[PDB]
A paper describes a structure:
Notably, C. parvum PyK (CpPyK) is exceptional, as it showed no allosteric property. However, the majority of PyKs are tetrameric, and CpPyK also displays a tetrameric assembly in the crystal structure. Each CpPyK molecule consists of four domains: N (residues 23–32), A (42–112 and 212–389), B (113–211) and C (390–526).
A new feature of the CpPyK structure is that the two monomers in the asymmetric unit are linked by two right-handed disulfide bonds between Cys26 of one monomer and Cys312 of the other. The final model also contains two sulfate ions, SULF1 and SULF2 (corresponding to SO4 527 and SO4 528 in the deposited coordinates), and two glycerol molecules, GOL1 and GOL2 (GOL530 and GOL 531 in the deposited coordinates), associated with each chain. Each monomer in the asymmetric unit of CpPyK binds two sulfate ions at equivalent positions, one in the C-domain and the other at the interface of the A and C domains. The sulfate ion in the C-domain (SULF1) occupies a position corresponding to the 6-phosphate of the effector molecule in different PyKs (location E in Fig 4A). In spite of the presence of the sulfate ion, the loop between the two C-terminal β strands in the molecule (residues 508–517) is disordered as seen in other PyK structures without any effector molecule. The second sulfate ion (SULF2) occupies a small pocket at the interface of the A and C domains and is hydrogen-bonded to two NZ atoms (Lys464 and Lys470), the hydroxyl oxygen of Thr471 (all in domain C), and the peptide N atom of Thr103, which belongs to domain A.
Residue numbers in the entry:
A (entry chain A), B (entry chain B), C (entry chain A), D (entry chain B): 23 to 32, 42 to 507, 518 to 526
The structure:
């Protein structure tokens, strides 16, 4: 019905876009490009790089953002988390293995590993496997089986002949990994980078229960040395990356400021045909809870070595948007891909196209019905704004906010109209970069409602978002309908 | 569902009540009683009485209203319109007739009629009938047949032996009555009573098309001599009383300020079984258009000579409310009945009871869906107010209004909450006495919104309409949600 | 919507009509007339008449039915039940009373009563009241108050001056009446009239719980002497006539073959404004249960002394049909009214008119959704027949049935199409005369499906119910769609 | 809701699967394997191979089908259509090109091409391009630009350095290709293979309008020499592969027996972001019309060189099923992939899993509402069967059919129950291998309905599709509900 009206034709994008910043796009020029193509949030994967690499990247993001005064860019720190990685190889050159050979794996991490004895970051490895256990390297590339266990090593038997590099992933199927969700390095990165440099999001890797989220809350509340004793309003985004997280989803979602659905280990703990079911379900639950949800399964793989993607990758992003996703995330397409700019631009257009397939009145009633009544005043105002915008055929919903909460609530009810959030706090604007359909205007002051609305309508007119004679809904416990001069 | 919740039990009335004031309830004491039983509007039927009778009644109504300052009483003038009535009988005593006898009817209205020659107010009577024409008197009591036509009289043959009195109704089936909808007397009554004494409603008898309505509009605009050159805002309520009125209903409804469904001639022009179908349709169309509708078919006939009505009469009122009727009107039950006070009280309780059978969310969506979009700003505001009242579970919807238009728009969407209209103009309050579920607060000034709302909430608290901590929606292009202090 | 399409116009009646047979219409000629006007079922009120009067009436009904071979007439016995009546008056002439006088009431039933000492049928009267209790005669006409209680009498004080006749009703507010629901006379009438003469319905007066229904079931099962040891399939219709019945409705409805909502005492035990609520609720519950429901509050009172009714009475029948009533019943309009034929004809046309206001697809989905799944095979076939008829725009639903059960199930789902029930058993056809929209064809044999359908389509074509080329749904666990030759 | 019930758990597949048969799976043993993994239809892509290659494959398919008598395998011929392919390379070895060099292209198809002068099958190539025209080879691999046009050749300038092989695809963007939709070779393949060997489907490449479909109809009706003068019932499945096909879709869809959504040229004529929008619309229109639709964009690309696919590829299949797709098609994954058997098995499990996300009652009402009424008799029967299956909670819908039309109609309404089609004609069974949720029982005779149903139920019991006491709907204009013995 709505999809067919689009075919007869064969309004800016609402779904936010997160880009992972790596070597391929670390410089100012590239970052500006990424903003122009549609980047809402820049992500720093703390599984990679060092302190100096991260800090430079951060400076570059902010410099690039300064070059784009009509844009707001949020910055996300994605924790390393409880991962197991291999060590450095022979001098620095990659190594292949053949089935049948006996490969040794030492826990002496600071050791150069050859074709016979590689290294491992997990010092509790010997006490975590048994004779016969399977050890997976590079996410199902080097499959092995334990033959011996020593004090600080294991000896495995290479089962299938494959090629792997350095710092590769490692997996222990059916084995409990004795690592914390927030280890010592994660704490250091949270306090001494995210809080210290005033970042906007913490993507918490491998969250498994509400207690993981609460530990992060506690860390934030006990570390205010970088903000004059004032607790950061930095947002916790929990990454569901395994079966435990899926089982405890409700608790995690309820505790967090947002959810990210990511590849992780999930594809090894459940049947692969079931992954899409879990994703769809987690997205719907986030929609009902009004918590932002990020879809991030590295959707455009083919765009690390190709100018444009294949159908399957585009339909994945389209269907993620249609499932109700707030943001989509690019991983190695931008971080270390050959065509970082092409991917974002493609992804952006796909999102916009998928959003034309939405039956907005129907979507609104679905969400409105799913929310138990009575609600708080702010949420009621939000609903009425969306209903009003529909009833007068308004082009914009403008919200004057000091925290972004009303803007998040309007976003929850999925208006067809673009939401313009007006605030005096730049941090609030960056925080809103994960909320669907929210554009932000940062102001010097927010005290004079009339003036704020006037400037917002003038600026929106300049940006081709509204025209003279068009209606806009203004919200600030209060709702009004104004006409664009 | 909603009706069955009520059966297990075996919130003030929203439907407004119109009482016809006559001899039985003309005095101050009686009118005070009628207010206490639930009278919203006092109707003066200008088919009966003289100037002095009407003027005394008008004073009594207004004196009674002063004795009840928390109430607001509207005053309606019901026009004589194009009717044919007989003259005075033998001295002043009633006369019966027997079939077979030849009854004469003269057009000399100033004459005492006997059992052989009666009188008639319609001077064009001879030129309107032919030999064999049927002449009905007292709405199907004296059925006669024309035998001779003279210059200023007709001679008929009494077909059925019945008893009749003075000033009785007269009908000419299948004959065109050459009388205007608004004649000399009607103009006189509108200008020198309704406008002159500042009444609130003109109930316009036998409206047949839009042109009839527009003639009344013209009279109103051309007669501002009693209001300092400012046109009155007196409401035109067109009475649908015949087949023509039904045929042209849409035009009439669109031109009018409201609609009254009355008995009139309709039952003689269409099959009686079709009347309730016409009524249901007319009520639905009024609901959709947002125009007040009055149901008035003399619902409680039995209560002119009995303490209480029978089932059929109560169900009639109940179903009128459930059909969507804004007001119910009592006729001979209050005017010249033996039990006026019992009637009103009964009708009030039935209305309240029928209102407990309503599924309010379902009703809201039915009306909201029937309204073509986009709507104008105030209608959108009204909708949003009703939805917000629901979503926070508010007790009141308060509207600050200078005309009553917003209160009418809110009323259209049928909220479960009582609607409180705050105005500075007492005429606006009186005009709203035909909008369902609206109560009116008259204030000295309406300028300071915060103050207006504070005093409205305090007065509502005093009247036990709201309690501390309860929510109320306040509307004045603008909508907000406040908590009662 | 559907009501307005009808107004633009300003298909046979579905709602069945029950007529009470009394002195005014006891003869063959009158009964034939009643059939022609629309009588489905003839009712014998066993509160009145004697054995000889009842038997003659029965013969007349059956003779009249023989004169109408294309009609099926059901016969209903309405039990006297636990009622209290007054005795015979002075010789035989009616008597009036004045407030203040002390009226005596003896329990010596076989005694002529004057203006000072009347008689009473209830011998336990003295042991049922106390000093100060109120005794009501003729349903709130003679209001009295006990002054003395003797062995076989009471002395009351006339409170209000009114006029009453013989055999008048009597009521004891707030007092327990020690009479059985099925007394000795009721049992006699059930066994020696209803079963003996093979009647179709027993309207059981003043049912108060399921045990009352079960007593009647037991009586039927223990009295097969008039039907060769084969238990009668006579249908029990329980009359809800008081508060107890309303409280225990679910149990009563679940036990019975049908429900009648009647005047009884209800109007004295609950507030009168609540009666319509209870009726609406009981009708809906019967619709959901698929049990036939009869509305019978003496809807056309004014038609005992008038040619035509008033609006309130017509709208009552219209709204009863719209509430979901299967049958409407006339009481004193036919039994002892001046215009028995006029009333039925009016009532019939009203029903037909009200049925045009029904949104059939909407009504179907409402009932279909209210019924818990899974259902039995016969009910599933019934639903599919109704859906099929809609989908092909069929004109008839024909059902071959030996018990009428499938015809009752189709009726439950309220098709717009007339339901034609084909059976070889005349008793089955009469039983179906209380099911909405069911017309019956009685056949010699029912074995050849093809032939039965052919004859039914031919007969229906002759009766102007279907035309050549039109579709009909044929049902007999099996459903087919045939075309009318 | 339905997706989340599946997450808590973390019924056979209904969606049909088309496998393309090539070198990797040509032998009997492989084809048996493909049947066991879930192949419904075997596709022969006549763009590759010769007569003997196709004929051997046809025999192997048919021998493999005999080894699985409980399965039914359909056979599809996919036409070469209007395509442009290069010739053979240097002896037989592939050749790479570097940008800047001038590549020649001759129209002499019978020639061995080097790194300087390649060959081409399109003889009108010189008269189709101009100076500056872009010539694409291997679907955007070798981008060239015309420098010279000769009588039977063109000289181009290699724009981008890429590697290509033999028989590669060739495109002329913005140039009209003067080739018929059904040429000499296509006619030959349709008549002397599809019709001659009695295949079940013609997948018609690059259908652009209704006229193309009607030409294929004409060929079929004019060629009955291999079926004794009886026109084949071979299904025309039009492939939408370009913008023209999309523009004229309605006409094509109405003329065709089914629709295939293929990759084709579409991605070169419209923005890539718009492809999924077109696909969703085309699937919806097919669902509404009741025509089978095949989704086939080479969904599992990664499984030509990998054991299992990535997320995007699985979600693509999952969402195709949820969009309403009747069949999914595998291309190079089975034809010449390294892991054919793993691919099919994965795609099958995804389909089944996606099918558990369906709200079956909701889906039924959506389709039922979209169908304009009235429908024809068999469509009404199909609807009623689906509703009855639901209402009694049946396990199977069994249809006795001579053409398969009723089975297709039932399929259209998407019952949760498996549909069992009973036919005497093996071609009918094979034709139904593209209808979702239909399984087929081939019988010697179909005459005795009772017997047919008995044997169908017994065979279904044997296959564990139904148990004793379970209900099944039987359809053969007629519908009934039976219990499995």
């Amino acid at each position: 019905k709505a999809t067919c009206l689009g075919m007869d034709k064969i309004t800016q994008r609402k779904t936010q876009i997160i880009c992972t910043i790596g070597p391929s796009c670390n410089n100012v020029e590239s970052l500006i490009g990424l903003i122009d193509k549609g980047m809402s949030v820049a992500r720093l994967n703390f599984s990679h790089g060092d302190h100096e690499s991260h800090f430079k990247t951060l400076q570059n993001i902010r410099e690039a953002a300064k070059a784009r005064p009509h844009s707001t860019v949020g910055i996300m720190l994605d924790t390393k988390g409880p991962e197991i990685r291999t060590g450095m190889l022979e001098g620095g050159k990659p190594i292949e293995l053949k089935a049948g050979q006996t490969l040794k794996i030492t826990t002496d991490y600071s050791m150069l590993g050859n074709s016979e004895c590689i290294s491992c970051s997990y010092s509790l490895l010997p006490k975590s496997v048994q004779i016969g256990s399977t050890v997976l390297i590079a996410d199902g590339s080097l499959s092995t089986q334990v033959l011996e266990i020593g004090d600080d090593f294991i000896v495995c038997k290479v089962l299938n002949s494959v090629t792997i590099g350095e710092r590769k992933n490692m997996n222990l199927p059916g084995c409990k990994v004795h690592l914390p969700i927030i280890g010592d390095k994660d704490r250091h990165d949270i306090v001494d980078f995210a809080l210290k440099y005033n970042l906007d999001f913490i993507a918490l890797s491998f969250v498994q229960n509400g207690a993981d989220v609460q530990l992060c809350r506690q860390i934030i509340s006990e570390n205010t040395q970088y903000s004059n004793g004032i607790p950061s309003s930095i947002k916790i985004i929990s990454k569901i990356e395994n079966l435990e997280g899926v089982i405890n989803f409700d608790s995690i979602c309820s505790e967090s400021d947002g959810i990210m659905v990511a590849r992780g280990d999930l594809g090894m703990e459940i049947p692969p045909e079931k992954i899409f079911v879990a994703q769809k379900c987690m997205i719907s639950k986030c929609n009902v809870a009004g918590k932002p949800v990020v879809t991030a399964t590295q959707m455009l793989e083919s765009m690390i070595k190709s100018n444009r993607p294949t159908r399957a990758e585009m339909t994945d992003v389209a269907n993620a948007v249609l499932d109700g996703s707030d943001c989509v995330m690019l991983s190695g397409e931008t971080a270390n891909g050959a065509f970082p700019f092409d991917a974002v631009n493609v992804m952006s257009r796909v999102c916009a196209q998928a959003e034309t397939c939405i039956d907005y009145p129907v979507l609104y009633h679905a969400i409105h019905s799913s929310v138990p009544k009575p609600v708080a005043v702010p949420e009621a105002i939000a609903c009425s704004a969306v209903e009003s915008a529909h009833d007068v055929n308004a082009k914009l919903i403008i919200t004057i906010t000091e925290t972004g909460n009303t803007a998040r609530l309007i976003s929850k009810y999925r208006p067809s109209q673009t939401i313009i959030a007006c605030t005096a706090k730049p941090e609030v604007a960056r925080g809103l970069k994960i909320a669907r359909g929210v554009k932000t205007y940062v102001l010097n002051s927010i005290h004079h409602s009339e003036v704020v609305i006037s400037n917002a309508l003038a600026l929106a007119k300049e940006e081709s978002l509204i025209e003279s004679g068009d209606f806009a809904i203004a919200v600030h416990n209060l709702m009004k309908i104004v006409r664009c001069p």
